[PDB]
Amino acid sequence: EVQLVESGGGLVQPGGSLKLSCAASGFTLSGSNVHWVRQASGKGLEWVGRIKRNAESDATAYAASMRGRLTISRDDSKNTAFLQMNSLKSDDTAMYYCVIRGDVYNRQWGQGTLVTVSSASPTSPKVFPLSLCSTQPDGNVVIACLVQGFFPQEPLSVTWSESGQGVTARNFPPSQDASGDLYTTSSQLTLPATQCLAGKSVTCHVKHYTNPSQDVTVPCP
């Protein structure tokens, strides 16, 4: 598949520096001007800067609010462009995207990477199997996993070992804990009762940040 792949994000101390990479996969970046755009959680899209093609001497331009703290560069030999940020502040926390412009052959956005400017270390979720204590719905069984106390809030995803006809997984966005600065959510699975009998279990698989994923067994009632 053809796409733009970003890397180099994650946690960074206030005042720290971080270099994001935007690597073309399945197309050639050389023909494009490369732009960077960011989006704070729940907010809009804001341009960060660009670099022109080598034909135009790789000219750079930066957003007013970050001008003195950015260097955009490109390495066509690696089919990659870079966003070097320096002297980072809390208000630079956002999901950063790269975007190509100017090449009639290719139009692509990167998948985005979250940059979190914080003095905190990352915290892996604490994942627990849940058992319903109220009544099961007619014909079906509900089980869930609690995904508690993680940071940063993304990337986070949950998948279950059962899917298909009559099976619905519900995944709720992270929300901030009422105290303590971490995030929590849950994942729910609803499946035909006959598919979740006593003696059967189902697993929830939880991915977070750039650390190893977790697999938790959830007993059927």
Partner: protein, 219 residues
């Protein structure tokens, strides 16, 4: 900088019916070639914006025929002629006449449907969590519409605040309902001092509140 503005900021449309979104620019985006330096995107939560239309009216690769862009100069319109469930998300217009590239505020399209009252499910803290010193009680709401829903937590009939959190799913692909997860988090010490844990739900569709409860140690 060029200011982009959209209207409305939200809309609700039933499947098969048309949606339109207006976009205005503070400078004309008209090009010498008769096209306009104006692009539309659809963004789903957490995902990169997807190009729908560029040059004012050119439909991007693989974009369905139901999406159309029109307008000229300072005034543009995105039309979705027959809305489908998969079209829910936030739509942005954007100018590329100059840097800085600037975007409109975002218009959230959701899928209209009839009222559906939530079903409610309560889960006590897991034994494994309790041993680590924390107790989370979880209340899940499923299959409701519209999106507004109220959860109240009670512990021995005392209303709780400052110790819970919630989040809401996007609409279900098949029935366009929402789901919600509310979590009440106490210390293990506080949790074991109390008996009756209850989550009370109210909603447009509920003629009476639904309260799901348990007595600590009875699950």
């Amino acid at each position: 900088d060029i200011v982009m503005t959209q209207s409305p900021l939200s809309l609700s449309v039933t499947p098969g019916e048309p949606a339109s979104i207006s976009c205005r620019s503070s400078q004309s985006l008209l090009r010498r070639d008769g096209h306009n330096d104006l692009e539309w995107y659809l963004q789903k939560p957490g995902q990169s914006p997807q190009p729908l239309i560029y040059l004012g009216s050119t439909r991007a690769s693989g974009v369905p025929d139901r999406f159309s862009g029109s307008g000229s100069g300072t005034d543009f319109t995105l039309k979705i002629i027959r809305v489908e469930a998969e079209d829910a998300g936030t739509y942005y217009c954007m100018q590329n006449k100059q840097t800085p590239l600037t975007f409109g505020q975002g218009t959230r399209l959701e899928i209209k449907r009839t009222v559906a009252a939530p079903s409610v499910f309560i889960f006590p803290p897991s034994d494994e969590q309790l041993k680590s010193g924390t107790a989370s009680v979880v209340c899940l709401l499923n299959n409701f519409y519209p999106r507004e829903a109220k959860v109240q937590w009670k512990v021995d009939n005392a209303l709780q605040s400052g110790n819970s959190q919630e989040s809401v799913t996007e609409q279900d692909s098949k029935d366009s309902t929402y789901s919600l997860s509310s979590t009440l988090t106490l210390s293990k010490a506080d949790y074991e001092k109390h008996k009756v844990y209850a989550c009370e739900v109210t909603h447009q569709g509920l003629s009476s509140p639904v309260t799901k409860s348990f007595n600590r140690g009875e699950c």
